[PDB]
Amino acid sequence: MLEAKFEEASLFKRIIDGFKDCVQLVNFQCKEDGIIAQAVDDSRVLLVSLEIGVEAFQEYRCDHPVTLGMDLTSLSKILRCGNNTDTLTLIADNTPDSIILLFEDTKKDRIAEYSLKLMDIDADFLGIEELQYDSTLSLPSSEFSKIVRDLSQLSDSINIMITKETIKFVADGDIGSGSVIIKPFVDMEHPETSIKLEMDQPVDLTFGAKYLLDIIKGSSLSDRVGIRLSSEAPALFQFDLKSGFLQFFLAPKF
Amino acid sequence: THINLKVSDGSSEIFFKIKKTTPLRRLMEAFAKRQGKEMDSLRFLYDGIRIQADQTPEDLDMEDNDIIEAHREQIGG
Ligand SMILES: *C1=CC(=O)N(CC)C1=O
Ligand SMILES: *C1=CC(=O)N(CC)C1=O
Ligand SMILES: [Ba+2]
Ligand SMILES: [Ba+2]
Ligand SMILES: [Ba+2]
Ligand SMILES: [Ba+2]
Ligand SMILES: [Ba+2]
Ligand SMILES: [Ba+2]
Ligand SMILES: [Ba+2]
Ligand SMILES: [Ba+2]
Ligand SMILES: [Ba+2]
Ligand SMILES: [Ba+2]
Ligand SMILES: [Ba+2]
Ligand SMILES: [Ba+2]
Ligand SMILES: [Ba+2]
């Protein structure tokens, strides 16, 4: 028995809308203490992992772990029918092959119920917390957005380079070339504008701008961004959310 | 309330008498001046860990007679 009940269907719509940018399929790992929205893009390059914690809901029951694979197009179709100030509850039993979406309107008025068929998402999700990375930095989301949006205009590739006390994004191209150098920087009057860097190894990794463009959309949900890089694993982009947590995993370019 | 610290590198030991609530900046400045050196060029270590200038003896639980190692700061990295 799973009963995930959001106060407003707009909160769930916002999540479904977000994923709809990167991915087309999503796999909802529902557990006792929340839901983990796992997703792989169509090129299998970018991996999305979203932690929706118990506190995100108005009521949450999960007596047993269930996995709910859903088509994001179909799911959007149902989402249109209910009102934004409607209470949305996802209902599934143990071992589900179908799911129920219950929209409810207040006072004890109106209940709208729609069914959706789950799909089987077989491939195992490779969310890598990776026990150790070469470099870990954190910076304002807006700043990281600005950099990525500028340099993507110069190329489809953005290289990230970490040295002792230096982070450098670079994009060379055919019209021109550009690069931002940013440094560790702390301010007490405005702590939310700090840049943190930790290094154990220099890193030099090239990334597809279109992917980084997808990632930066996480800033609309958070004001800092954690970036953990390493020459063996995909890069980890993390955002802290009220819901819980947002993680992108990106394969470097050859 | 006033612990007594001994600061030293390889060749020079000094005693400073600071209050448990005074930040350690005052003392690192004072040791670096008495060597005609700048505070950024020296790396102060207490019982392994590198002291931060803003930290106080209280924070680090410095008892009487504790030793602060001073080492040179390498430029890289
Ligand atoms: C792609 C952009 C984004 O914000 N998310 C999660 C909500 C994606 O999957
Ligand atoms: C939800 C509203 C609606 O009209 N439909 C049919 C496509 C739904 O699934
Ligand atoms: Ba897209
Ligand atoms: Ba709440
Ligand atoms: Ba609640
Ligand atoms: Ba509507
Ligand atoms: Ba409501
Ligand atoms: Ba069943
Ligand atoms: Ba190039
Ligand atoms: Ba939080
Ligand atoms: Ba320095
Ligand atoms: Ba002690
Ligand atoms: Ba003690
Ligand atoms: Ba001691
Ligand atoms: Ba230095």
CATH of the domain at A237: 3.70.10.10
Q: Whose CA is closest to atom 9 on ligand 1?
A: A19
Alpha-carbon span A124 to A5, nearest angstrom: 27
Contact between residue B29 and residue B39 where contact means Cβ atoms under 8 Å apart: yes
Chain B residues whose beta carbon lies within 8 Å of the beta carbon of residue A163: 77
Write out the two tokens for A207: 């990334």
Alpha-carbon span A171 to A178, nearest angstrom: 5
Q: What is the CATH number of the domain that holds B41?
A: 3.10.20.90
| DSSP class of B48 | T
Contact between residue A47 and residue A36 where contact means Cβ atoms under 8 Å apart: no
Query: Which ligand 2 atom sits nearest the alpha carbon of residue A79?
Result: 1
Single-letter code of the amino acid located at A151 = L
Alpha-carbon span B59 to B66, nearest angstrom: 14
The answer to whether A190 contacts chain B (CB < 8 Å) is no
Question: At A62, is the secondary structure helix, strand, or coil?
Answer: strand
Alpha-carbon span A67 to B40, nearest angstrom: 56
What is the number of alpha carbons within 13 Å of residue A153 lying toward its C-beta?
7
Q: How many domains does chain B have?
A: 1
Residue A46 buriedness (CB in 10 A; 0-12 / 13-18 / 19+): buried
Say if ligand 2 is within 6 A of residue A19 CB: no
Alpha-carbon span A116 to A104, nearest angstrom: 17
Q: Could you say which ligand is closest to the alpha carbon of residue B40? A: 11
Alpha-carbon span A159 to B11, nearest angstrom: 47
Q: How many domains does chain A have?
A: 1
In which element (H, E) is residue A72 found?
Answer: helix A72-81
Q: Which residue has the tokens 């050196």?
A: B37
Is omega for the bond preceding B77 within 30 degrees of 0, making it cis?
A: yes
The answer to whether A188 contacts chain B (CB < 8 Å) is no
Phi, psi for A223 (deg, rounded to 5) = -100, -10
Resolution, Å (one decimal): 2.8
The CA A199 to ligand 11 mean position distance, Å, reads 15
Question: At A143, is the secondary structure helix, strand, or coil?
Answer: helix
Alpha-carbon span A151 to A182, nearest angstrom: 14
The residue segments making up the domain with residue A195 are 1-254
Say if ligand 1 is within 6 A of residue A50 CB: yes
Strands B4-8 and B67-72: parallel
Closest by alpha carbon to A144, among A212, A245, A50, A47?
A212
The answer to whether A164 contacts chain B (CB < 8 Å) is yes
The residue segments making up the domain with residue B35 are 1-77
Q: Report the 10 Å Cβ neighbour count for A83.
A: 15
Alpha-carbon span A73 to A16, nearest angstrom: 9
Nearest-5° Cα angle at A188, A186 to A194: 30
Say if ligand 2 is within 6 A of residue A77 CB: yes
Closest by alpha carbon to A16, among A7, A4, A28?
A28
Alpha-carbon span A205 to A134, nearest angstrom: 11
Q: Which residue has the tokens 């102060």?
A: B44
- Could you tell me the CA-to-CA distances from B40 to A76, B33, B35, B36, B74 in Å, in that order? 58, 12, 13, 12, 10
Write out the two tokens for A124: 């195992």
Question: At A15, is the secondary structure helix, strand, or coil?
Answer: helix
